[PDB]
Amino acid sequence: IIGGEFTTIENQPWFAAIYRRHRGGSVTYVCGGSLMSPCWVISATHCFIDYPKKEDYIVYLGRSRLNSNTQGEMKFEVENLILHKDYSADTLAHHNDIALLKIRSKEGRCAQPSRTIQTICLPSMYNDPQFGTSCEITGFGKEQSTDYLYPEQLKMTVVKLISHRECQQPHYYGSEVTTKMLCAADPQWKTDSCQGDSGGPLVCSLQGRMTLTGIVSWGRGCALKDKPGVYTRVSHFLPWIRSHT
Numbered sequence: 001i002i003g004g005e006f007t008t009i010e011n012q013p014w015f016a017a018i019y020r021r022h023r024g025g026s027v028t029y030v031c032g033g034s035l036m037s038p039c040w041v042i043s044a045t046h047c048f049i050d051y052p053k054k055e056d057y058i059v060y061l062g063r064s065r066l067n068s069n070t071q072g073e074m075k076f077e078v079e080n081l082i083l084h085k086d087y088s089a090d091t092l093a094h095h096n097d098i099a100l101l102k103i104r105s106k107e108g109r110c111a112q113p114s115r116t117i118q119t120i121c122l123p124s125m126y127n128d129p130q131f132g133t134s135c136e137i138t139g140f141g142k143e144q145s146t147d148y149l150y151p152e153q154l155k156m157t158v159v160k161l162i163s164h165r166e167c168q169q170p171h172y173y174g175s176e177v178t179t180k181m182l183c184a185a186d187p188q189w190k191t192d193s194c195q196g197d198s199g200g201p202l203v204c205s206l207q208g209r210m211t212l213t214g215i216v217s218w219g220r221g222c223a224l225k226d227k228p229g230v231y232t233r234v235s236h237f238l239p240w241i242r243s244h245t
């Protein structure tokens, strides 16, 4: 996350940290997720499509630093990885970038809600915030496009939703962004999501409720001029979501 502020998991309790074990025993950070229901995390199909075996993934809840056990965290394996069957990727844009992970403990249990571990509510059909709304994103992703390491402590920032009409303009994304996707950014291009933040939450306060409005999906550069973050518009996938859970 370019700019913003470090923060800790008690300020984002639905954020899930998804790692992958490799042959030989090392483990590295993959993408973020959001806790939807006690047994289900939602993220982006692009983070898992090239390594689709459910056994390799580790999920943490209640975790604030990349490389330490925070008090109160819980660790999960994946009972079920569901990718969208119509996912695709173009040169920039990705389609139907949405995945579900049914989580379980070694003992067989789903998440146990607590002060650091909580779900985030889905949106309702046809009702997303108006353009210009301020929303937050959180993740362990890059602090500068040229870094090659992710920060050791969790970060957050705030960005504003951008309309389809503006985001379809020639110097922004043209026809490559569709009505299934939401655009969001900083009017001054100083802060943004970036590589390593994919799959994480875009949380919007709407009618007094916090809502999982988008899923971090893609973007040209990070906090580059007239290049917004682009996010999966969760409200279109409520039919798909309910049927696979």
Ligand SMILES: N=C(N)c1ccc2cc(C(=O)Nc3ccc(CN)cc3)cc(Nc3ncccn3)c2c1
Binding pocket: 046, 047, 050, 142, 145, 146, 192, 193, 194, 195, 196, 198, 216, 217, 218, 219, 220, 221, 222, 223, 228, 229, 230
């Ligand atoms: N600017 C953004 N809001 C934003 C959001 C998501 C991004 C995802 C990615 C990204 O690469 N995701 C990703 C997509 C598909 C696969 C599997 N082949 C593997 C990985 C890259 C971004 N841009 C970036 N630019 C310079 C340095 C680092 N990253 C992203 C930018």
